Every structure is written in structure tokens, then in C-alpha cells.
Amino acid sequence: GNFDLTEALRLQLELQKRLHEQLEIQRSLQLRILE
Amino acid sequence: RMRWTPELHERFVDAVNLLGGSEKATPKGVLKLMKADNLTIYHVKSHLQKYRTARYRPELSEGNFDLTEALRLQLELQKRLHEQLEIQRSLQLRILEHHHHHH
Amino acid sequence: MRWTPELHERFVDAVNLLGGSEKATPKGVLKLMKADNLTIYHVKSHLQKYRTARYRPEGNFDLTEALRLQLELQKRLHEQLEIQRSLQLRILEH
Amino acid sequence: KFGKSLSSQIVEMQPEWRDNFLSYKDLKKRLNLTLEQAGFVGLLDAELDKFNFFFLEKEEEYVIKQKELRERKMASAEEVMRVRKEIVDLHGEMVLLENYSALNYTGLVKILKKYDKRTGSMIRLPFVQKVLQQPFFTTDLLYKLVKECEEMLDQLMFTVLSTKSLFLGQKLQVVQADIASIDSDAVVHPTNTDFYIGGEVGNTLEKKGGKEFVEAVLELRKKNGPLEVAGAAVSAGHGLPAKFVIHCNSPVWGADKCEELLEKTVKNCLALADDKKLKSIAFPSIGSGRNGFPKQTAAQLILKAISSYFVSTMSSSIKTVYFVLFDSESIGIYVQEMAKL
Amino acid sequence: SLSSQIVEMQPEWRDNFLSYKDLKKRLNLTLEQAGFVGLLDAELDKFNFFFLEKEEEYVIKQKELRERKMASAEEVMRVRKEIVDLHGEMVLLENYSALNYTGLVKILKKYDKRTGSMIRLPFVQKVLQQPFFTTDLLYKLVKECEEMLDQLMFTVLSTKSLFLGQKLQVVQADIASIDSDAVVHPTNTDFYIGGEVGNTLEKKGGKEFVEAVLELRKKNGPLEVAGAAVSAGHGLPAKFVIHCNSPVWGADKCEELLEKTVKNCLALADDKKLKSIAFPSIGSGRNGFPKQTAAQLILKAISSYFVSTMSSSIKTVYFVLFDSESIGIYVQEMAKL
Ligand SMILES: O=P(O)(O)O[C@H]1[C@H](OP(=O)(O)O)[C@@H](OP(=O)(O)O)[C@H](OP(=O)(O)O)[C@@H](OP(=O)(O)O)[C@@H]1OP(=O)(O)O
Ligand SMILES: O=P(O)(O)O[C@H]1[C@H](OP(=O)(O)O)[C@@H](OP(=O)(O)O)[C@H](OP(=O)(O)O)[C@@H](OP(=O)(O)O)[C@@H]1OP(=O)(O)O
């Protein structure tokens, strides 16, 4: 069952990456609007 | 065919320069100078359109610390997002390969 | 005849006012610069020099460092000329 | 929640970029659902074709633009090189004119002495006095011009252990000092739900602060009651050089989502610091030790939370974040993980 | 003298200095007094005319160069801004493609769940063949853009500036990959290369490094305690490698021996006029020295060496460390420097 655990870990990493990329693209568009 | 790549665009600009200025170059002459396979006059000509439009510079005929820091902050944010997207690419490829070889 | 960067700045402004830099008349520039008793001859020669000068016909870090060394040598030579001037004046004082 | 994040990213983009991501109306159609499922897959193929067209157009534009900008960069470098070369040459020519003047002066003094010796007169001194008044000798303007060229060429060409200037504009300093004596606007005090003061941080804050500090802690507990996990509260730094003290209930290693709770603890501390319009905050060793977090994990989580907080809060007033550390291993770990932000 | 000075000059400078023809005139000679003074005044007027002409020319040139420089600066700033903006647009396109791919995957999973089918994998295989979501060329464009921006404008962990301007830098890198002039190799009397630094240095250098070590051992023989010897950095980014025999903890006067080891390494670095030197963790661990004691003694040796050696050519001293506790100890002890 270690394969399924690895797959779940990779999915969790994917979600974390999605949230971080959202924060960064938000900050970039913010900087554009402010300038 | 329509996938313009840096090498193909370099060949295109070289042919244009052989014909002269981009404003006076002819798309038929450019097509004759480019031996690229499956290259139609339509693609050559639309690409000459986009190139000539991009090459125009109207700005020629007409605190700095804060500006430079804002620009550097923007660039740094973009770099961070690019590397994060690369990591996401790797993770997606791994997951897809495992799902392909294990179902 | 004694041209200085301030008077030359005023001259360039007057030339910019009087049409183009090439299509300029020294008499009109003198009319735009009624100060310091400027003459038509001197202003005309200065405009000739300015027009002839404004024409622009149409490892790298090793070369940049050689250029830096050239600048440093020229600065040292300038300082040596300065101490030369002071020394020679003090000799003249005896 | 992927759709919500996607839409929140879309709304902030340019009209060209929107309506080119796939619509999330396909969930509605999906609900209404093998022939009509084949029609749904055809809709997916239409979305694919849209992506293809948009991406190819943007890619061609970018290729053209990049070749153009590389050409312009090469031209600009060449022009800067030519300009600095010409300026250095002009500097040299001015120096050469100075040397011309001085050398002619020397030769003139020589010939004046020879004349005075040949005739037996004494005209060298007044003649040189008149020479000093000649404009070829008045080289003050040359001094000014050489200084201008040189300035143009110049413009053209409490112990702190470790510092990191964050890319977002803040300063992260690992320092070593008594956290109660450090002149920081906010000082973080990790405690429990009942606001214990038995912490080493709490012990030194009770030693430095007076009875009013303990009374302020008691009044904070009276107002807010119990402090939930990852939560945080603010009290006034009475009897302390610090302006405010931020108490927090750090989670325990092994709990459900304890890493996310540690990140939330850090973010709540920073949010409370911004709520008081403070410019500096001091963090002790949080997570590791008492709460059982491994040192590297806690360090990386705290630094992650700080960086992401400052990404999502451009209006933050915090300019400096201090890390008061005494354990050598913790200091090295914080330096390593801080240099990678 | 004077003529030899004016030889190497442009034509307009020649025949504009003091002509020495007047010597003959002086040999021919108050009527001639007036003649001579008139000739001298003519020379003075020539000097003044030439000087004022050159001064006017220089003023014109300086004005033109100032304007040209401001124009070039504006162009530099414009190019920089546009390249940053293009980098941003390309990253935005990458994010476009990634988000669309993720949405497609989510929708395929939901479809396979609701309809009870299995088409997510072949549909994603089809997606992989599409013009979008093939961002190798776009990634290369972004990378070249970042290169150009780096031109347009190894990790240092801590930096300490000494009184005479020397830099002590704790960095995180491979000691064999650093471009420092000298790299210190802790060894024993027989130039043993099996140590940690030995293995990484050998990985980088290879046969050439081993041959250099063997030749140095043959030329020097036994490496005395607290001694040091230099070998050429063949096959290594470093120019030279300074092998030292650190003393053993508990030996007679092992503190002074470690101080002398560090100072001898520094003296060998200065003998070859080297500008930088890289130090690994010396004495601590293999030779039984406790970490903090060895770090402090080494830092004291370096400081007192730079105090007693005013002609030292060393400007930067690197500390390549891997253990976190060692890094923290060195940071703390440099704060005490
Ligand atoms: O965008 P998702 O990642 O698919 O998240 C949820 C999903 O939950 P998951 O996080 O577990 O995937 C919900 O399903 P549940 O597992 O909670 O039952 C689902 O449907 P419900 O909330 O109505 O149950 C909901 O909406 P949808 O039906 O469109 O898939 C959807 O979130 P979205 O509305 O953002 O798609
Ligand atoms: O002009 P210099 O390069 O300095 O050298 C001397 C000069 O020396 P000083 O001016 O330094 O004293 C002599 O000057 P006096 O003897 O008149 O004081 C001068 O005259 P003499 O011929 O009488 O020696 C002689 O002139 P010339 O080139 O004709 O020889 C000349 O040059 P020299 O270096 O060849 O002696």
C-alpha cells in the first residue's frame, strides 16, 4: 500500500503548490494595479 | 507549419534582411529565400505582418530608486512563480507516469 | 570668444528656438542672445563648430578594465600637473 | 475549491487572458449527463482547440519580442561602451591641454632666464606676472570640465548573527540577546491555552517587566478567556522596552495538521503585529524543544509562513523580523533556511 | 626633452609650442629688446588662441556627450523594463497552460466518476500531444530572458568584516567547486586523501589531483605536525591546495599547534600572493577537537595573523561547512570577532 500513500502525498504536494502559485500571481497582479 | 520557432524566425529575419528593410521586403521574395518545408505564402505573410508591427518604436519620436525597486520586486515574483510552476510540472509528470504504469 | 558651458547651454537653447539645429542663422541666434556683447562673427563660427560636431556618422571586461586603467593614469597625470602648477608658483614666489 | 481559486485568478487578469481558460460551466453540463457523453467529450475537444489557438498566437508574439529585445540589448551595450570610451578620451585630451600649457610655461621661463643673462637685464619676473594673466594659463575651467567628466564616468560605471534582505522588502535578522531587552515593537511569547508564564521567554519577560506586566497578562486572559490552538492575542508591553507582547498557543508535534497550525500561528502573530501598525517583531525559538517539533522542520515552516504572509499582504507595515536564538544548531539551521528564501 | 615630448602628439599641437628659433635671435642680440618682447608676445597670443579654440571644442563635446549619455541611460531603462514585462507575460502563459491542464484533469476525473468510464488517461495522453502544454521552448525563452536580466541587473551564509578589510564568509557549497584561490586540505603526515575533504577533492580532481598529492609527498616527505605544504590545483577550480597536518586534541600544546597550522596555511597563501582561501572544519571531529574550541582558536589565529601581517594579500577567507551546528558555532564566534 506504499504506492497509494506516495500518490496521496503527491496530490497533497500538488494542492500546496496550487495555493502558493495563487498567492504569487495575486501579488503580481496587485503590484501591477498599484503601479 | 504555423509553429514559428526562434530558429525559423531567425531564418525569416535573415531572408528579410537579404531583401532589405522589413518595410520594403516582399513576402513572395521571403518565401523564395526560405527553403523551409511546408511553408506557405499565407504563413510567411501573416508572420511578416506580426514582425513589422512589433518592430515599430513610436517612443523614439516625441524617485528612480522606488521605480527600480518596484521593477526588481515584480521580476523576483515572476521568477518565483516560474520555478514553482516547474516543480508543479515535475509533480504532475510523476503522478501521470505512476497512473499510467499502475492504473 | 571665451565660451563656457553656461553660455553654450544658452546658445543651444537659442538654436533650438530658431528652427532646426542645421537650419539656423547666427544673426537670429544673436537676436535671441542680447547679452555679453556677442558678435555675429563669433556666434557664426561657434554655430559652424557646433553643426560640424553634432554629426554622428552611421572578453569585453578586459577592454573595460584597460579603459579604467587609462582613466586612472589620466587622473594621476592631472594631479601631477596640479602639483606642478602649485610648485612652480611657489618657485616664482622664491 | 479549485474553481474558486481559478476564478479569483481570472477576475484580476486582462480581458484578453480571460475567456481563454476553460469555463467551469462544464460542471453544470456534467451534472445534466454514451452519445450525449460523446457530445460532452466533443465540448472538451473544443476547449482544447481554443487553448491551442491562443497559446500559439502568444508564443509567436513572444518569440518575435525576445529576438527584438536581444537585438536592442546588444545595441545598447555597444552604445554605452562607445559613450564611455569617448568620455575617457575627452578627459585625456583635457589633461593633455593642461600639460601643453604647463610645458610652454616652463620653456618660456627658460628662455626668459636666458634673455636676462644675455642682456644683463631683469625682465623675467614682470613678464611672468603678465603671463599669469593669459587665458592659456587660466585653467580653472579645465579643472571644472575634468571634474564633470569624472563624475559622469563615476555615475556611469544586542548582537546580530545573520542578516537576510528579503526580496519583498523586509529584513530577517538572526540575533542573540535577551529578548526582553531587545527594542522591538512586538515580542512573541509562546504559551498555552491558560497563558502560562513558565516559558523561558515568559521567565525573562517577568524578570524584566514589573507587576504591571503580569497584571496585563491576567487582564488579557480575562478579556479573551482561553487561547485556542494556533490562536494569538496582544497585550501592552508595560514595564518593557517593547511596545506590545503577542502571546500565541503553538501546537504540539504529532497533532492533526500540526505543521499547518504552526504556519497559522506565525501568520496570526504577524497579522496582530500589523493590526497595531508595528514595524518590527521578535520571534524566539518556536515549535522546537517543548512542543517536540524537529528543528529543521519548525524553522522551514516558520520561514515559509513569514514569506507567504508577506506575499499575500503587500500593505503590511512590518519592516524587520528578528529571530532570537541561542542554540547553535538552531542558529545554523535558521541561517541555512533563511538564505534560501 | 621638449621636442621629444612634443613628438608623440597630433599635428595641431606641433608648431604651437614655444619655437626655439628665438635662441638664434637671442644669439643675435633696447631696440632688439623690443623686437624680442614682441616675438614673445606673439608666442603668447598663439598659445592663447590655440588654448581657447581647444577649450571651446571641449565644451561643445562635453555638452554633446552629456546629452548622449542621458539618452543611452533612458534606452537602458526601457530595455530592462520591456524584458521584465516579457518575462512576466511568458510566465503568465505558463500559468495559463498549467491551470487549464489541471482543470481538464479534474473534469476528466469527475466524468469517469459520474459516468463510470475510464478515459482520463487516454484523454490526458491526447492533451500531451497538443500545441499548448508543450512549454519546453517557452521555458528556454524564460531562461534566456533571466540570463539577459542577470546581465542587465554557492550561497553566502554569514559575513564578518575585520579591521583591515578582510572578509570572513561562512558559505554553503562544495569546497571543491569553489573558485577560491587556495583550498585547505586537512591531512596527516603521509598526505592521506581519504578524509571528507579528501574524497570530495578527489571526486573533482581525479588522477591529476592524486598525482599532485603524490608528487608533493615525494618532494616534502613527512608532513610535520602543524606544518603545511602547497600543491598545484590540477583539475580543480582552485589555483592551489594547501595540505596541513592538524594536531590531535589532548596533545602537548595542541592549541598553539592548531593556531600555528592556521597561520602557516595563511602564510603559504600569502607567499604566492593569493587573494582568497577556503577553510573546511579543521581539527574538530577527526582530530578530537570540540567544535566551538576549534572554531574559536582558528578565528583567533586568523585575526592575530592579519594583525601581525600588514602586507597580507588575502582579502576573503571562506569557511565551507556542512553541519548545521558547525555553521551556527562559526556564525556565533565570528560575531565575537
Ligand atoms: O473542486 P473539488 O476538488 O472536486 O472539490 C469539491 C468536491 O470535494 P473534494 O475536495 O473531496 O474533491 C465536492 O465533493 P465532496 O467530496 O465534498 O462530496 C464537490 O461536490 P459537493 O461539494 O456538492 O459534494 C464539489 O463540487 P462539484 O460537484 O462541482 O465537483 C467540489 O468543488 P467545486 O464546486 O469547486 O468543483
Ligand atoms: O636647455 P637644456 O636642455 O636645459 O640644456 C642646455 C642648457 O642648460 P640649462 O638651460 O638647464 O642651464 C644650456 O644652458 P646655459 O649653459 O646657457 O645655462 C644651453 O646652453 P649652452 O650651449 O651654453 O650649454 C645648452 O644649449 P645647446 O643645445 O646649444 O648645447 C642646452 O642644451 P645641452 O643639453 O645640449 O647642453
Author numbering:
A (entry chain E): 330 to 364
B (entry chain C): 248 to 309, 330 to 370
C (entry chain D): 249 to 306, 330 to 365
D (entry chain A): 2 to 34, 67 to 190, 208 to 391
E (entry chain B): 6 to 34, 67 to 190, 208 to 391
Paper excerpt:
Phosphate (Pi) starvation response (PHR) transcription factors play key roles in plant Pi homeostasis maintenance. They are negatively regulated by stand-alone SPX proteins, cellular receptors for inositol pyrophosphate (PP-InsP) nutrient messengers. Under Pi starvation, rice (Oryza sativa) PHR2 (OsPHR2) binds to a cis-element (P1BS) in the promoter of various PSI genes and up-regulates their transcription, thus optimizing rice Pi acquisition and utilisation. Our results reveal that the SPX2 senses PP-InsPs to inactivate PHR2 by establishing severe steric clashes with the PHR2 MYB domain, preventing DNA binding, and by disrupting oligomerisation of the PHR2 CC domain, attenuating promoter binding.
To reveal this underlying mechanism at molecular level, here we report the crystal structure of the rice SPX2/InsP6/PHR2 complex at 3.1 Å resolution, using InsP6 (phytic acid) as a commercially available surrogate for the bioactive PP-InsP. Based on this we expressed an engineered SPX21-202/∆47-59 construct fused to the C-terminus of the macro domain of human histone mH2A1.1181–366 for carrier-driven crystallization. In the complex structure, two InsP6 molecules bind to a SPX2 dimer, and two copies of PHR2 wrap around this dimer. In the SPX2/InsP6/PHR2 complex, the SPX2 dimer obtains a domain-swapped conformation, in which the N-terminal domain of one SPX2 protomer interacts with the C-terminal domain of the other SPX2 protomer, forming an intertwined dimer. Specifically, the domain swap involves helices α1 and α2 (NTD) from one protomer and helices α4 and α5 (CTD) from another protomer, which are bridged by two antiparallel extended helices α3 from these two protomers. In contrast, in our rice SPX2/InsP6/PHR2 complex, SPX2 adopts a domain-swapped dimer conformation and coordinates two InsP6 molecules in a 2:2 stoichiometry ratio. The helix α2 of one protomer and the helix α3 of another protomer form the basic binding surface for InsP6 / PP-InsPs. The binding surface in rice SPX2 is formed by the basic residues K26, K29 and R31 from protomer A, and K143, K146, K147 and K150 from protomer B of the SPX2 dimer. The MYB domain and CC domain of PHR2 mainly interacts with the helix α3 of protomer A, and helices α3 and α5 of the protomer B in the SPX2 dimer, respectively. Specifically, SPX2 blocks the assembly of PHR2CC oligomers by exposing hydrophobic residues normally contributing to the stabilization of the coiled-coil structure (including L340, I354 and L358 that correspond to the previously characterized L319, I333 and L337 in AtPHR1)26.
